[PDB]
Amino acid sequence: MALRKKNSLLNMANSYVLDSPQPSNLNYFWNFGSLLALCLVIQLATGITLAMHYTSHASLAFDSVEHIMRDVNFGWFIRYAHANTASFFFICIYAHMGRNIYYGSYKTPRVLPWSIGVIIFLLLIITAFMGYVLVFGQMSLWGATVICNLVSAIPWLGEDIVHFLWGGFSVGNPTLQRFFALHYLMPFVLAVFALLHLIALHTAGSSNPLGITSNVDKLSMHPYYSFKDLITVFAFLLMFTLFVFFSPDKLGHPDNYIPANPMVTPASIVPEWYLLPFYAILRAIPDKLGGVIAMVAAILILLILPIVDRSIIRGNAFKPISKLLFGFFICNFLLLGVLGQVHIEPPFIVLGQICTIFYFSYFLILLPMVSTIENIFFYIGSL
Amino acid sequence: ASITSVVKTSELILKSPLLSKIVVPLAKTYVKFSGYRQLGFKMNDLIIEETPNMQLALRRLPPTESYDRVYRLIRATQFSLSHKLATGNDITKPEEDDHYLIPYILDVEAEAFEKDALDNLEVV
Amino acid sequence: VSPKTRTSNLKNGLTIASESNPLVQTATVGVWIDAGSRNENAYNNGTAHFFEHLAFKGTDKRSQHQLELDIENMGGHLNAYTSRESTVYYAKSFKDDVPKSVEILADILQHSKLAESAIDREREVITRELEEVNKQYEEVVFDHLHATAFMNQPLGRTILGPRENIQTITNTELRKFITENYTADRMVLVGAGAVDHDALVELAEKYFSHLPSSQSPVPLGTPIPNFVGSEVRLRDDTMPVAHIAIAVEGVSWTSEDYYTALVAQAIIGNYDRAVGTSRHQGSRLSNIVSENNLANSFQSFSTSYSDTGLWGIYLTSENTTQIDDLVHFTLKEWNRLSTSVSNLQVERAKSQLKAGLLLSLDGTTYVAEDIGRQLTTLGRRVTPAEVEAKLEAVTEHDVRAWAQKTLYDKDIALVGLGPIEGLYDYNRIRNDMSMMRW
Amino acid sequence: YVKKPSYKIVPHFLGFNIPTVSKWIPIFGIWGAAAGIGALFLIEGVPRTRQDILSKIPIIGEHWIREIPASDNPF
Amino acid sequence: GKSTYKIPDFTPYLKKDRNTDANRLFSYFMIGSFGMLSAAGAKATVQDFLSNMSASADVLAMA
Amino acid sequence: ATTFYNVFVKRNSAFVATILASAFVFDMTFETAIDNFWDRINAGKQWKDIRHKY
Numbered sequence A: 001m002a003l004r005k006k007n008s009l010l011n012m013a014n015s016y017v018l019d020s021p022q023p024s025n026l027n028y029f030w031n032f033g034s035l036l037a038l039c040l041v042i043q044l045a046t047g048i049t050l051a052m053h054y055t056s057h058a059s060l061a062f063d064s065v066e067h068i069m070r071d072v073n074f075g076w077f078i079r080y081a082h083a084n085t086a087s088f089f090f091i092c093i094y095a096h097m098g099r100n101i102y103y104g105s106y107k108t109p110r111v112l113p114w115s116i117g118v119i120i121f122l123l124l125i126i127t128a129f130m131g132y133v134l135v136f137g138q139m140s141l142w143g144a145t146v147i148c149n150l151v152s153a154i155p156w157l158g159e160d161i162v163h164f165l166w167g168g169f170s171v172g173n174p175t176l177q178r179f180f181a182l183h184y185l186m187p188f189v190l191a192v193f194a195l196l197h198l199i200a201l202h203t204a205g206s207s208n209p210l211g212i213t214s215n216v217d218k219l220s221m222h223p224y225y226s227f228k229d230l231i232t233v234f235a236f237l238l239m240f241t242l243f244v245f246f247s248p249d250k251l252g253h254p255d256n257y258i259p260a261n262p263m264v265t266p267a268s269i270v271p272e273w274y275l276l277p278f279y280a281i282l283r284a285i286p287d288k289l290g291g292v293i294a295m296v297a298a299i300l301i302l303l304i305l306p307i308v309d310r311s312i313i314r315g316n317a318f319k320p321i322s323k324l325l326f327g328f329f330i331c332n333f334l335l336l337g338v339l340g341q342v343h344i345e346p347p348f349i350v351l352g353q354i355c356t357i358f359y360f361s362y363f364l365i366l367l368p369m370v371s372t373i374e375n376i377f378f379y380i381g382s383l
Numbered sequence B: 001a002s003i004t005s006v007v008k009t010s011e012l013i014l015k016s017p018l019l020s021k022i023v024v025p026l027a028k029t030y031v032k033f034s035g036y037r038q039l040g041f042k043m044n045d046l047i048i049e050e051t052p053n054m055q056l057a058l059r060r061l062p063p064t065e066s067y068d069r070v071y072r073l074i075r076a077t078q079f080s081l082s083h084k085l086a087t088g089n090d091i092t093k094p095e096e097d098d099h100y101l102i103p104y105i106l107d108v109e110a111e112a113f114e115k116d117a118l119d120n121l122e123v124v
Numbered sequence C: 001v002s003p004k005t006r007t008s009n010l011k012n013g014l015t016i017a018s019e020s021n022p023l024v025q026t027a028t029v030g031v032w033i034d035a036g037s038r039n040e041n042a043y044n045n046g047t048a049h050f051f052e053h054l055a056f057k058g059t060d061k062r063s064q065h066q067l068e069l070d071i072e073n074m075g076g077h078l079n080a081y082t083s084r085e086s087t088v089y090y091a092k093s094f095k096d097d098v099p100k101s102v103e104i105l106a107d108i109l110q111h112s113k114l115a116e117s118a119i120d121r122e123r124e125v126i127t128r129e130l131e132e133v134n135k136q137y138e139e140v141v142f143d144h145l146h147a148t149a150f151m152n153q154p155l156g157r158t159i160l161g162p163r164e165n166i167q168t169i170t171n172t173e174l175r176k177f178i179t180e181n182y183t184a185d186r187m188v189l190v191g192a193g194a195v196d197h198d199a200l201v202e203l204a205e206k207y208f209s210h211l212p213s214s215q216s217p218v219p220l221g222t223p224i225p226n227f228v229g230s231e232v233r234l235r236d237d238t239m240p241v242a243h244i245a246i247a248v249e250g251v252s253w254t255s256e257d258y259y260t261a262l263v264a265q266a267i268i269g270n271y272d273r274a275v276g277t278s279r280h281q282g283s284r285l286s287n288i289v290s291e292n293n294l295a296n297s298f299q300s301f302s303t304s305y306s307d308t309g310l311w312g313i314y315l316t317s318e319n320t321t322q323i324d325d326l327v328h329f330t331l332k333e334w335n336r337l338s339t340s341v342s343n344l345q346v347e348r349a350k351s352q353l354k355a356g357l358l359l360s361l362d363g364t365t366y367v368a369e370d371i372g373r374q375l376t377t378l379g380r381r382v383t384p385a386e387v388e389a390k391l392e393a394v395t396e397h398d399v400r401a402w403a404q405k406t407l408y409d410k411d412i413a414l415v416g417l418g419p420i421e422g423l424y425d426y427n428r429i430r431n432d433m434s435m436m437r438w
Numbered sequence D: 001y002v003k004k005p006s007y008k009i010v011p012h013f014l015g016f017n018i019p020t021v022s023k024w025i026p027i028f029g030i031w032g033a034a035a036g037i038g039a040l041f042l043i044e045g046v047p048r049t050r051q052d053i054l055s056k057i058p059i060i061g062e063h064w065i066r067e068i069p070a071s072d073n074p075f
Numbered sequence E: 001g002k003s004t005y006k007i008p009d010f011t012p013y014l015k016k017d018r019n020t021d022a023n024r025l026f027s028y029f030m031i032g033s034f035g036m037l038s039a040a041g042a043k044a045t046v047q048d049f050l051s052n053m054s055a056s057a058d059v060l061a062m063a
Numbered sequence F: 001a002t003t004f005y006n007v008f009v010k011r012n013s014a015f016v017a018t019i020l021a022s023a024f025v026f027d028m029t030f031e032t033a034i035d036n037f038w039d040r041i042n043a044g045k046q047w048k049d050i051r052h053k054y
C-alpha cells in the first residue's frame, strides 16, 4: 500500500487534496472555494504581520497604521494587501454562495455543509467589522458607534450589554483593545468552521453543475482541479495587483484617513461596501428592534432554503423560470447594496422597502411557488 | 416534494379540461426551453437520487434500464465538461423521454407513506 | 366459548381438573406438581431432574422393559419435564386408553424402584448431558441469566445441578425428595381432550388415593428473591452468532401487574428475519431492527415465578459490529414504555393479546398444560371472560406507571454469548435504561 | 361476525402525533423551568437583574438590596 | 473453577438493599451534589472572569 | 425515598432543575456565610471596623 494511503496523517491530506474523487464536470464557479482559502491564507499572513507593528492603544493606533505605511519596509504593501483582500474575500464569498444557491448545493444531502457555511459567513462579517475599527479613523469610530448601538435594541438588557461590549460609556480605548484581541482570534475560529464544512461535505462529495450524481464518473482532485485552480489563482492575483499597486484606496473611504474624533460626526456613516445590503434591509424597517431582527433574519433565512425549495431536481441548470427568478433575486441584492449607501431621502426610502420585501419574498413565497410549478411542468411536459 | 405529490397534482390538472388546455402547452414549452434533452437526458434522469427512497427505487430498476441510465449520465457529464450539446441520435427525442423511474418510486413511496399512516393508527 | 373446566378434589387433597373436547379422539392426562429444582438445597441440587430419569427405569411391578412394552401397547406416549418450580408427567393416548395411562403414571410416581444399579447407570447419562446443553445456546443463555439475576439463591441454581452432586446422589435422597415434595396437596391430575371428568375422578380414587398429604397444606402456587444487577460474558469469537439476554426483575404469577407486564412485553414483541411477515410488524423495535439488519431475531419475554419473575428480551445477531446499536435501540424502546407510550400502542397490544392468550391453546397437550400451569400457580383456572376483563383493565397509564417503577433507570441482568466484543461494559448498557432528555 | 378491523389514522407530522406530544408537554415545562432557573442564576450578578427581578421577591429579596456607604465609595 | 453457572463470590461487595429506592437515591444525591457544586463553581467562575470586560476602575473614575 | 426519587430524580428534567435551584441557593447562602466568617476571623482589622472613627 502507498504511504499516502497507509499513514493516517498523510491519508487525511490525501483524502482532501489528492485522491479526493471529484465530479469530472465542475465549472469555474467551483473555483471560489480555493480562492476563499487563498484569501484566508493572505489575511492570516498579512494580518499576523500587521500585528507585529500595530499598537492597539487608542492613543497610538491610528499613528501605528501610519508608521506601517511610512516606515516599515513594504508596510504599505502589507497594509494595502490586507485591506483589499478583505474586499476580495467578500467578492469570493458572495460568488461561492451564489454558486451554492444557483446549483442547489444547499439541498439534501448537503444541508450540513450549507448550514455551517451560513455560520462562516456570519463569522466573516464579525471579523471584518472588528478589523475595520482597528484603524481608529473617523469611519472606524463612527461605524463602531452606530453598529454597536444596535445591540441597545435587545429588550431590558440592551443598554447594559452595549456598555459591557464597549468596556465603558462610549467607544474608546477599551473597545479598541478588545476588538484587536478578538479580530486576531476570529480568523482562527473561521478556519476551523471552514474545515468543518469541508468535512461535512466529504460524505456526499461536491455537487456538480448538472445536479446529478457524479458517482458514475469521478476524477482525482489532483492533478485536474489543482491545475484548474491555478488559473483562477493567477486571475485573482492579477485583480489583486491592479488594486494593491495601482489603485490601493479605490475600495475605501477617505474619512478613515482622518483620526477618530468623538465630537465631529462624519457627513455620512456607511458600512464597508460588502455590508451595504444588510444595512439597507435594516433601514427599511422603521422600528429599531424590528430593523435589527430583519437584518439578522436576512442572513439566517439562508438556513431555510433546504425546506422552501420544493423541487424534485437539484439546481437551476434546467429550470428556465427558476433561472429568471434567481437573476431578479441577485440584481435585487445588488440594488439593496446601492441603496445602503444613498442618503435617507425620497424616493430611496420606499424603494428600499420594496427591495426588502422582494428579498424576503424570494425565500418565503416565490421559490416555494416556482419550484412547485416547475415540478408539475417537468412531469406533464415530458409525458 | 415527493414524486407522489407531483404525480397526483399533475393528474388533477390533466383531468380538468380547462386546466389541461392551458397547462399542457405551457409545460411542453417549458420542457423545450429546459434543454435537458439537448444533453441526451430523459426527464427522470434529473430527479434527486440521494434519498433512501430513491436509492431503493434505483435498485429496483431492471438491469437494462439501469445500464442505460448509467450511460446517459456519463454521456451528459462528458457534454457538460466539454461545453458541447448532443447532436443527432444523442438528442433525446420527445418519444424517447419515457418515465422509466416514476412507477418504481411511486411504489416505494406508497409503502413508505402507508407505513407512516399505519404507525399512527388508533384502535376504535 | 370453550367448554367449562371441571374441578374436583379427593380426601387427601389431590385436585382433578378436566376440559373435555368431543371433537377430538386423543386425550392428554397427566400430573402437574407444584415442586421443582427450587425445592432442593445446594447439596441435593439436581435430584428433581435425576428422579425424572429414574421414573422411567422401572417400578415394583413392571421392570424397565415391561414399562416400555406397556406404553408401546397403549399406542400413545409418555412425557415429563422438570423446571425450577414445576414438574409434569403426562400421557397422550387414545380416548379409551386413558385408564391404562393413569395407571402407569400412578405407578411410576408412587412405586418407582430407584435401584442402585439404575442410579449408577443414569449417573453417566446425566454426566454426558452436562456437556451437550453447551450446544443449545438459548438454554445456555437463560441458565446463566437465572444464575446471575438470582445470585446464590435457589432460583439461581440450574436444573441439572453440579457435576459433584450427580456423582453423589443416592436412592435415599431421591426417595426423601419425592416423599417431601410429591404430596397430594401439591399435585393436580389433569385431563384434556376426549376425557370424561367423572371417569377421571374415579381413576384418581383408584390409583392416587394412597398419596401422602403434607403436614402443613398451603394453597397451590404458594412460594425472598433479591435480584442482582450483574453480567455474565461468555465470549466465543469462533461462534458466528451472538446471543444476548437482558432482563430486569419482573412479576410473579399473582402480581397485580401481571397483565400490565404482558401488555408491555407485547408492545416490544418478537421478530425473526426468517418469517416473511416480520418486516411489516407494527412494533417500533421490529422496524428499527429489520430496516438496519441489526439482528436475526429477538424475543420479548415475561417469565413468572411464585414470588418474582424476569422481564426482558433475548437477541440473536450476526451483525458483530453493530451489537452496540442493537442494544442501544432496544433499551431506547424500553425507555419509551416510561416516557412516550399512549393509548395508540397499548390498545394495539391489548388487541393482539386478547387473541394470543386463546390461540396458544390449540391441542390437547397445550390445553392440559394450560390447566395444569394455572392450577399449580394460581390455584384455579381463570376463564377467558376473566382474562378478557383483566386485559381490558390495563390502561396506557398503568403501563407507564409499571415501566417507571420496573424498567426505568433499573439494574439489569445481562448475559452475552459468542462474538460479543462489541457489547459495551455494564455501565454503558445500564446507562441506556434512562433518557437524559426526559 | 366482524368484516373489518376498526381503526382510524390520527393526524401526524414529521413522525409526531398529539397523543405522544401530549405526554411530553409536562417535560418541556420542567425543562423550561430548568432553563429559566439556570439563565436567571447566570445573570444574578448583573445589577439590573437584582434591581428589577431579584430584589422584588418577598422576604428573600433583601439579600440583593445592598448599598455601599457614601464614605467608602470613590465613584 | 470449571462450572460457569457457579457465580464467583461477590459477597464482599454486594449490598443487601441494592434494589431499594433509598439505595439509588443515595448515589444520585452524590451525583446531584457534584452537579450542584459544579454549577455553582461554573457560575462563579464565569461571572468573575467575564466581569473583566465591564468598565475598569480607571474608566469608572472618569465618568 | 420512593416519593423523593419519583419527584426530584427520576425525570432528568426535574433532576437538573433541582440541581440548578440548589446551586442558586448554595451560591447565595455560601456567600453570606463566608462573608460573616471572614469578618469574625479578621475582626478589628478591616476598614469596616475602623471606619467609624472617621
Ligand code: HEM
Binding pocket: A029, A030, A031, A032, A033, A034, A036, A037, A040, A093, A096, A097, A100, A105, A106, A110, A113, A114, A116, A117, A118, A120, A121, A190, A194, A197, A198, A201, A205, A206, A207, A208
Ligand atoms: C472561509 C470561507 C469558505 C471557504 C474557504 C470555503 C471553501 C470551500 C471549498 C474549498 C469547497 C469545495 C470546492 C468548491 O465547491 O468551491 C466548498 C464547498 C462548499 N461550501 Fe464553502 N467555503 C467557505 C464559505 C462558505 C460559505 C459562506 C458557505 C455557505 C453559505 C459555504 C457553503 C459551501 C457548500 C454548500 C459547499 C458545497 C458546494 C458543492 O460542491 O456543491 N461555504 N467550500
Ligand code: HEM
Binding pocket: A040, A043, A044, A046, A047, A048, A049, A050, A051, A054, A065, A079, A082, A083, A086, A089, A124, A127, A128, A129, A131, A132, A133, A134, A135, A183, A184, A187, A190
Ligand atoms: C478573515 C480574515 C481577516 C479579515 C477579513 C480581516 C479584515 C480586516 C479589515 C477589513 C481591516 C481594516 C483594514 C484597513 O482598512 O486598514 C483589518 C485590519 C487589521 N487586521 Fe485584519 N482581517 C483578517 C485577519 C486578520 C488576522 C489573522 C490578523 C492577525 C492579527 C489581523 C490583524 C489586523 C490588524 C493588526 C489590522 C489593523 C491594521 C490595519 O488597518 O491594517 N487580521 N482586518
Ligand SMILES: CCCCCCCCCCCCO[C@@H]1O[C@H](CO)[C@@H](O[C@H]2O[C@H](CO)[C@@H](O)[C@H](O)[C@H]2O)[C@H](O)[C@H]1O
Binding pocket: A005, A011, A012, A013, A014, A015, A016, A017, A019, A198, A199, A202, A203
Ligand atoms: C483541505 C485541506 C487539506 C487538509 C485535509 C483536512 C484535514 C482534516 C481531514 C480529516 C478529517 C477526517 O476526514 C476523513 O478522513 C478519511 C481518511 O483520511 C476519509 O476516508 C476516505 O479515504 C480513505 C482512503 O483515502 C478510505 O479508507 C475511505 O473509504 C474514504 O471514506 C474520509 O472520507 C474523510 O472524511
Ligand SMILES: CCCCCCCCCCCCO[C@@H]1O[C@H](CO)[C@@H](O[C@H]2O[C@H](CO)[C@@H](O)[C@H](O)[C@H]2O)[C@H](O)[C@H]1O
Binding pocket: D042, D043, D045, D046, D047, E046, E047, E048, E049, E050, E051
Ligand atoms: C451566559 C452567561 C450570562 C452572562 C454572564 C454575566 C457577566 C457579568 C455578570 C456580573 C459580573 C459583575 O457582577 C458582579 O460580580 C462581582 C464579582 O465578579 C460581584 O462583586 C462582589 O464580589 C467581589 C469579589 O468577588 C467584590 O470585590 C465586591 O465588593 C462584591 O460586591 C458583584 O456583586 C456582582 O454585581
